[model samples]
Target: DPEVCCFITKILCAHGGRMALDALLQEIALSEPQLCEVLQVAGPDRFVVLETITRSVVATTRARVCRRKYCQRPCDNLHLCKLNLLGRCNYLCKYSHEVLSEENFKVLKNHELSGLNKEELAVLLLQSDPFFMPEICKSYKGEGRQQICNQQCSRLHICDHFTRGNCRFPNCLRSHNLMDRKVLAIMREHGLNPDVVQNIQDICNSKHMQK
Candidate 1:
């Protein structure tokens, strides 16, 4: 369990850095006494744990830097390889890197996209313009989009029409709210700001109403 905790900490640190790791430990303290106890231990055990954590952090940082140097798109934007992995893109052409927006093809040629596997290179290649596939796109007639449902309606029974893919009522009695009060309460207990959460919800609702 201690080993598992150490590994998880490394993963959190890899993505979010030390501050994220610290925040997670603080959250764990509220509900996992055993894990907290393991983390508090010192001497040889602590040394080994720290070493593992440091290695993961370094490796993750290096990979991120490599990606930044080789790929032209914003780091937050999904790589072509990622879209391919998700089955959103199919072509694995030689001119993949040319598709990336603002991609420094010369830089990519110089560095060789180190620290990534073949799959990662494939994704990075598709990060440029002309070949870049937008995650969401519009067509001339109509556009399909992802909808985040926020409201809940009372329904004693689950709507058969919804299950059968024919629910069209304006006020359909089906719970559409993905997150309920209990989920928000738990998040608040783990140091999340309720006011901030409410503000985000308000913004989302305003956008939904506009649509």
Candidate 2:
């Protein structure tokens, strides 16, 4: 799984194929030194890109980035759920159905998606997922191999101690940090109860393990 990190995959996919270093650190709560291993870099700025406003990193960048800018659109950084926005999602859908928070709206503002209200934001995200399809169906590709198999996933990182800010295992192999959006996405899918996550042990022993 060296080539696969849910954190990296999620970011690259959801974002416009790039991520600023500062935002990257903020998302994972990773320290400066420890971050390198998680993202993979050799020198000062090899794979990393530099910018005056905020440089972003992507293994590669697309040739042309265009959209119906005249038309409006908007997710994983927590815009809202496309499945839920489509109103086809069940309670089991992991995407966030909760009210979009101001924090995430700040994210939208930077992405130029904050102009519209909540529903517009939701619709944009939905549209991005292909005419409001849930993006779950296997796209029997017309030229399938071009799109790598990256199932939209955010790992639970259920390292109980990580939440406590103390992980005892030095060589621990689980994610010690999860982005705010990642946490909410999991909680909503599992079931929510305000700020803290209770029932963790109960879920841990059975439901969580099964997943």
Candidate 3:
């Protein structure tokens, strides 16, 4: 049951909220007979539900029963992903979403996300967006590309002209006033080489006036 509990937690937390069973079936990638057995033990009311539009079981705050036991496991959003909090992250990010309803008393009972500590969450994100991380989201090439990109991409989508200056377009849709010291802090956090980042920004700023 512990393992079954852990399995359900990941699906609900990753989906991060309400979803249908067929979609759940796709994500679990297991036959309904097998998943159905484990899912039902996840039980009704407390840990599972939906009348038949027949949804699969989902995690609840009391689902923390397993979360506490499996603290080290991927029991769903164990540590919240920082960038996702920025509205900058695309869902490709596999981290905890802060979507619990406060009304669920059991919801507020869980300590995992309740009073999340700064250092802990920061380190968690370090793992989620590790080294050699790309600064841009590759719009889903060919097929699913448009399905993902340009809608709040968590990357720098600045215009090359704006970055290179001489942009007479006052109505420019690109972020010209972006990339200041505060923005640099994010670059620093992501481990971008300061020299390279500075050079690019400098080329866009000081040299644009020369002709």
The most accurate candidate by TM-score is: 3
Q: What would you estimate as the lDDT of candidate 1?
A: 0.32
lDDT of 3 by residue, 1-211 (tens): 5555555555554553334678877876778787777666654322444544666443433222121322464343334444454345665655555433332223333423333233332322232222223353344222223454546544654444544345666465544433556545656666544543543343344334442
User: Mind sharing the TM-score for model 2?
Assistant: 0.26
State the lDDT at 127 in candidate 2.
Answer: 19
Per-residue alpha-carbon lDDT of candidate 1 for residues 1-211, written as tens digits (9 for 90 to 100)? 5444445334433332222335455554544455445544521112112222432111111011122325654444323343343244566442233333344333433333333344333422222121222211111111132332322312112233332224466775443231457534543443333433332233233223333
lDDT of 2 at 86: 42
Worst 10 residues of 1 by lDDT: 56-65
For candidate 2, what is the total of clashing residue pairs? 3
In the range 77-170, model 2's lDDT, one tens digit per residue, is 4434544554546665543455456656666544444444554444233313222221222322212254422454443434544333244565
Model 3 stretches with alpha carbons more than 4 Å out: 52-56, 63-211
> Candidate 3 versus the native: TM-score?
0.29
Runs in model 2 lying further than 4 Å from the true structure: 1-76, 90-95, 130-211
